[PDB]
């Protein structure tokens, strides 16, 4: 079968730069039959340019695409906010058809600091034998951020599990949860809860804390 | 407007059946290259089947012999019956008209997650993430729901039946069942007036939960 590898496999850009995704075909493709699709989380995939260089309806001018043989390239000749997704190539010269592995866009933007929130766990919730923390950091840039959680001063470890949201289509930040789970016996023995942050936006770590029963 | 419409989808048994389907609007399937396609979780997309005008099928090696591509020319619909599915199955399904014998493909349907697993269904338990000091800041405030245990994916969050708003991926829980926060992001000075209800929809447990968001000092 025709191997198709994409490079790069990641790609970071500011909005209004060029980007260049490559595909290479480890045998020459026939005709220049050659598509690109562009796939947002969560979404199917959207044709963006078939038969190497042809834009399919509807598509943004600022997509393109070009080569022959062996080599094809996907332009963004000028990055929007909204680009950030996946992208596939796929040849259809020789059967089977296959698709490359995909190169991610990630938007680059300023450096934005989360403002970070918590959350008790509900009374309804405890009810059950079990309390979940929640902490939220919210709109900020970049993606890496560590995340600690402190009861009663003492580091946890083993008992947070996090999530991150896709980029923010228009201002490219994330947001990130963080949720603590313990038991309701352990949530009870215990008076301060804290999440403490850092990231690259903030000066100094921020802590962000309540104490059991407010 | 040149569409496909899929239906089916859901939780399956390892070694059952699951049929998908698509309704196709503005092209006939009768007369086009169609085909399946999936992307299990994280990974790439890998054809499935084809199926051509004068009829002829074709396979990949991991489901030939045990997935049919079909057609009903006179409902303008094209089907997928898999069997004997197994876990390395699971993956979101779409269905697609081909431009080329070999792909090209201009028109997707929106896709469904086809789940393999021996688990039982479990509905959502849904709980408030009450707006506080602690979530506010200045002007706005978060509130949200915590939707937490529940098998398989996905469930769907609305809020008020839109702004502001960021539902997490779930995560895996070491229990084998999911978990996701939804918060919004609302004006400070709503949260004594305003009431905020989370409406949680999780299909494969036919669970409807509104769940009312208060806050707490």
């Known amino acids: 079968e025709i191997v198709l590898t994409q490079s790069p496999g990641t790609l970071s850009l500011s909005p209004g730069e060029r980007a260049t995704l490559s595909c290479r075909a480890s045998?020459?493709?026939?005709?220049?039959?050659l598509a690109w699709y562009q796939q947002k989380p969560g979404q199917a995939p959207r044709l963006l340019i078939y038969?190497?260089?042809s834009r399919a309806t509807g598509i943004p001018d600022r997509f393109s695409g070009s080569g022959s043989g062996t080599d094809f390239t996907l332009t963004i000749s000028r990055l929007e906010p909204e680009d950030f997704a996946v992208y596939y190539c796929?040849?259809?010269?020789?059967?089977?058809?296959?698709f490359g592995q995909g190169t991610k866009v990630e938007i680059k933007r300023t450096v934005a600091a989360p403002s970070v929130f918590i959350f008790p766990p509900s009374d309804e919730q405890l009810k059950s034998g079990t309390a979940s923390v929640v902490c939220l950091l919210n709109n900020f840039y970049p993606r890496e951020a560590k995340v600690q959680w402190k009861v009663d001063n003492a580091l946890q470890s083993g008992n947070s599990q996090e999530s991150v949201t896709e980029q923010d289509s228009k201002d490219s930040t994330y947001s990130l949860s963080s949720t603590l789970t313990l038991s309701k016996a352990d949530y009870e023995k215990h008076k301060v809860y804290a999440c403490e942050v850092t990231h690259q936006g903030l000066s100094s770590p921020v802590t962000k804390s309540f104490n059991r029963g407010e | 407007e040149v569409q496909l419409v899929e239906s089916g989808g859901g939780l399956i048994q390892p070694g059952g059946s699951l049929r998908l389907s698509c309704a196709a609007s503005?092209?006939?399937?009768?007369?086009?290259?169609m085909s399946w396609v999936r992307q299990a979780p994280g990974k790439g997309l890998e054809w499935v089947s084809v199926?051509?005008?004068?009829?002829?099928?074709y396979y990949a090696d991991s489901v030939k012999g045990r997935f049919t591509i079909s057609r009903d020319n006179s409902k303008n619909t094209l089907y997928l019956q898999m069997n004997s599915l197994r876990a390395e199955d699971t993956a979101v399904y779409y269905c697609?008209?081909?431009?080329?014998?070999?792909?090209?493909?201009?028109?997707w349907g929106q896709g469904t997650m086809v789940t393999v697993s021996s688990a039982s269904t479990k509905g959502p338990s849904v709980f408030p993430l009450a707006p506080s000091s602690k979530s506010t800041s200045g002007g706005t405030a978060a509130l949200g729901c915590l939707v937490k245990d529940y098998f398989p994916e996905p469930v769907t969050v609305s809020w008020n039946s839109t702004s502001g708003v960021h539902t997490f991926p779930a995560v895996l829980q070491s229990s084998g069942l999911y978990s996701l926060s939804s918060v919004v992001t609302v004006p400070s000075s709503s949260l004594g007036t305003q009431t905020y209800i989370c409406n949680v929809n999780h299909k494969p447990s036919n669970t409807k939960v509104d769940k009312r968001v208060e806050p707490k000092s």
């Open positions: 038969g190497a260089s």
């Open positions: 503005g092209f006939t399937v009768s007369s086009n290259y």
């Open positions: 045998q020459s493709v026939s005709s220049s039959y």
């Open positions: 796929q040849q259809y010269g020789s059967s089977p058809g296959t």
């Open positions: 199926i051509y005008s004068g009829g002829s099928t």
């Open positions: 697609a008209r081909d431009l080329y014998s070999s792909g090209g493909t201009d028109i």
